[PDB]
């Protein structure tokens, strides 16, 4: 204020700005085959938890 | 000037003083205005030695 005689004036204010873009969409999408859940010796319900786990 | 008070009239019609803040720096502003105004109501009434004077 000293150096600029001693005048001032009001300066414009502004804004910075991110974008979060909600733009990732990712499937899981897979057959457990009729004759395969017959013949198979156990389970295939971890096929569903392992689905969830690569998501 | 050799007169009679009643031979001349003034009026002042506004006599006002106020502050402000000054716009272009850390100031306050005093202004003060006056309006007003005069007549020689009677000529006569009125006697001026050297009017020419200056």
Do not use: C
Request: hydrophobic share 40%.
């Amino acid at each position: 204020y000293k150096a600029a005689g001693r005048q001032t004036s009001a300066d414009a204010i502004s804004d910075t700005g991110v974008d979060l873009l909600i733009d990732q969409e990712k499937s899981i999408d897979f057959l457990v085959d009729d004759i395969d859940r017959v013949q198979v010796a156990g389970s295939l319900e971890a096929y569903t938890r392992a689905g969830a786990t690569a998501l | 000037v050799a007169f009679h008070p009643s031979a001349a009239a003034y009026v002042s019609q506004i006599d006002t003083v106020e502050a402000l803040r000054d716009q272009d720096s850390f100031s306050d502003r005093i202004r003060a205005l006056h309006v007003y105004g005069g007549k020689v109501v009677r000529p006569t009434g009125v006697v001026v030695f050297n009017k020419t004077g200056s």
